[PDB]
Amino acid sequence: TRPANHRQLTFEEIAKSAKITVNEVELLVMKALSVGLVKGSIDEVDKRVHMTWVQPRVLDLQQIKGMKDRLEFWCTDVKSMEMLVEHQAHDILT
Amino acid sequence: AVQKVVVHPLVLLSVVDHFNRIGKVGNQKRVVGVLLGSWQKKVLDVSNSFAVPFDEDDKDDSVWFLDHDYLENMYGMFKKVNARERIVGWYHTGPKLHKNDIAINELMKRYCPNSVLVIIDVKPKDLGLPTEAYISVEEVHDDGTPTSKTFEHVTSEIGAEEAEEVGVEHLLRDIKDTTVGTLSQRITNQVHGLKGLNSKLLDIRSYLEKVATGKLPINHQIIYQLQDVFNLLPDVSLQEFVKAFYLKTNDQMVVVYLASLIRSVVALHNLINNKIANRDAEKKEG
Amino acid sequence: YAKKRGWVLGPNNYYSFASQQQKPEDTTIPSTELAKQVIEYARQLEMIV
């Protein structure tokens, strides 16, 4: 759900969404990582479970839409930022 | 696996000449010849190539002809003249490879263990690297394909040799070139690199809008695989990554600083050196 | 002091506040202009003076 902005979710949302006790979420996530559908990690001093990898899933038209939004939003930045290079050096690289 | 190949500059010209040979038709006559290479390593070497008669209609691309007789005789001549050389694959001048192109490889996989294709581009409008080659495989899918067969992209490069670098690079005198141009080839490199980035993005968005709406197959081919491309997308500006830059950038800035420091003094020597000789030769001249 | 300034004296004292930002350091903002500085560096160093 969250676009990897703060994906180091704490135990509580896991215990609520899966509605399992707090002392079992570790054993559940270690099983999921043992399977290999995710490549997160585990902290205990804060009991935050960091997320790194998610298996690629199926999506649909609207996901294609926002995806095209990211694609354009990044491509335009790439091109313009190269325009900054050429602008900064016209007769310098020959 | 072969995993890469080294093609010499002779070929990619020994194809252009033959595309020029039957190039009078103009409309369409796909040039197909024989590729010749070396059983070098996992990596493979490509040195020689030659042509062979080939035609094909417009509709129902299943009607194409490779003279096995011509192939046998002419390769007999090229073995008599070079046993060091040998057949390795084949090529075609198609700017974009055709659906028919798999039947050709599938035909001549009996001469070579795998007659690798070679796509060349007479008019590479892209200013990147043309003349890329593929090698077919089977990738039978969960869908239930009896034989999911499709070519494979294999990285390649341009071969080199002492003599051919001599003759070619003597021919490069027709145009100017800055290959020793200090800190210029790099700038050109990032330029052409970003150009390739923008081209690829414009292509993938062309495909993506087409599939998104109206008319295109919505297969699970890439649709999530390219999503995983989005998965990486490193969030540059964050907490400790700042310490990644400022703890090294100033390091290299220090070295550059010292370099400018000595460069200034070295430039300063010649001022004394010539200001001595000028006036000392002048006062003695008068 | 209660109107010109803060320190709202209700419970027997004036009362402070943070008076500080959240440390918004990008440090990649200069990632463009500094590259411009380097481009000037090799620019003048490469120019036939």
JSON list of C-alpha atoms in Angstrom, two decimals, chain C residues 5-48:
[
{"chain": "C", "resi": 5, "resn": "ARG", "atom": "CA", "xyz": [5.03, 38.33, 22.21]},
{"chain": "C", "resi": 6, "resn": "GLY", "atom": "CA", "xyz": [4.22, 34.80, 23.36]},
{"chain": "C", "resi": 7, "resn": "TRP", "atom": "CA", "xyz": [4.81, 33.33, 26.83]},
{"chain": "C", "resi": 8, "resn": "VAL", "atom": "CA", "xyz": [1.11, 33.18, 27.65]},
{"chain": "C", "resi": 9, "resn": "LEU", "atom": "CA", "xyz": [0.78, 33.87, 31.40]},
{"chain": "C", "resi": 10, "resn": "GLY", "atom": "CA", "xyz": [-2.21, 31.86, 32.53]},
{"chain": "C", "resi": 11, "resn": "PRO", "atom": "CA", "xyz": [-0.88, 29.30, 35.04]},
{"chain": "C", "resi": 12, "resn": "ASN", "atom": "CA", "xyz": [1.45, 31.46, 37.11]},
{"chain": "C", "resi": 13, "resn": "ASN", "atom": "CA", "xyz": [4.22, 31.89, 34.56]},
{"chain": "C", "resi": 14, "resn": "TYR", "atom": "CA", "xyz": [5.13, 32.72, 30.98]},
{"chain": "C", "resi": 15, "resn": "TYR", "atom": "CA", "xyz": [5.32, 29.78, 28.60]},
{"chain": "C", "resi": 16, "resn": "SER", "atom": "CA", "xyz": [7.84, 29.07, 25.84]},
{"chain": "C", "resi": 17, "resn": "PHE", "atom": "CA", "xyz": [7.68, 27.17, 22.57]},
{"chain": "C", "resi": 18, "resn": "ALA", "atom": "CA", "xyz": [10.03, 25.25, 20.27]},
{"chain": "C", "resi": 19, "resn": "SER", "atom": "CA", "xyz": [11.42, 28.21, 18.30]},
{"chain": "C", "resi": 20, "resn": "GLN", "atom": "CA", "xyz": [13.19, 25.83, 15.93]},
{"chain": "C", "resi": 21, "resn": "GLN", "atom": "CA", "xyz": [12.72, 24.06, 12.62]},
{"chain": "C", "resi": 22, "resn": "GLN", "atom": "CA", "xyz": [12.77, 20.30, 11.92]},
{"chain": "C", "resi": 23, "resn": "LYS", "atom": "CA", "xyz": [16.28, 20.26, 10.40]},
{"chain": "C", "resi": 24, "resn": "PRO", "atom": "CA", "xyz": [15.17, 20.16, 6.74]},
{"chain": "C", "resi": 25, "resn": "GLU", "atom": "CA", "xyz": [18.54, 19.42, 5.12]},
{"chain": "C", "resi": 26, "resn": "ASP", "atom": "CA", "xyz": [18.28, 18.20, 1.55]},
{"chain": "C", "resi": 27, "resn": "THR", "atom": "CA", "xyz": [21.99, 18.51, 0.60]},
{"chain": "C", "resi": 28, "resn": "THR", "atom": "CA", "xyz": [21.11, 17.34, -2.92]},
{"chain": "C", "resi": 29, "resn": "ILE", "atom": "CA", "xyz": [19.73, 20.78, -3.79]},
{"chain": "C", "resi": 30, "resn": "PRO", "atom": "CA", "xyz": [23.35, 21.75, -4.64]},
{"chain": "C", "resi": 31, "resn": "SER", "atom": "CA", "xyz": [23.54, 18.56, -6.75]},
{"chain": "C", "resi": 32, "resn": "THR", "atom": "CA", "xyz": [22.70, 20.68, -9.80]},
{"chain": "C", "resi": 33, "resn": "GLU", "atom": "CA", "xyz": [24.54, 23.96, -9.26]},
{"chain": "C", "resi": 34, "resn": "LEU", "atom": "CA", "xyz": [27.68, 22.23, -7.98]},
{"chain": "C", "resi": 35, "resn": "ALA", "atom": "CA", "xyz": [27.74, 20.11, -11.12]},
{"chain": "C", "resi": 36, "resn": "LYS", "atom": "CA", "xyz": [27.50, 23.47, -12.86]},
{"chain": "C", "resi": 37, "resn": "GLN", "atom": "CA", "xyz": [30.57, 24.57, -10.89]},
{"chain": "C", "resi": 38, "resn": "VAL", "atom": "CA", "xyz": [32.52, 21.52, -12.05]},
{"chain": "C", "resi": 39, "resn": "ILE", "atom": "CA", "xyz": [31.34, 22.08, -15.63]},
{"chain": "C", "resi": 40, "resn": "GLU", "atom": "CA", "xyz": [32.78, 25.56, -15.30]},
{"chain": "C", "resi": 41, "resn": "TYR", "atom": "CA", "xyz": [35.98, 24.02, -13.89]},
{"chain": "C", "resi": 42, "resn": "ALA", "atom": "CA", "xyz": [36.66, 21.75, -16.86]},
{"chain": "C", "resi": 43, "resn": "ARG", "atom": "CA", "xyz": [35.20, 24.56, -18.97]},
{"chain": "C", "resi": 44, "resn": "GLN", "atom": "CA", "xyz": [37.88, 27.15, -18.24]},
{"chain": "C", "resi": 45, "resn": "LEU", "atom": "CA", "xyz": [40.56, 24.48, -17.84]},
{"chain": "C", "resi": 46, "resn": "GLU", "atom": "CA", "xyz": [39.70, 23.09, -21.28]},
{"chain": "C", "resi": 47, "resn": "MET", "atom": "CA", "xyz": [39.32, 26.47, -23.00]},
{"chain": "C", "resi": 48, "resn": "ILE", "atom": "CA", "xyz": [42.22, 27.62, -25.15]}
]
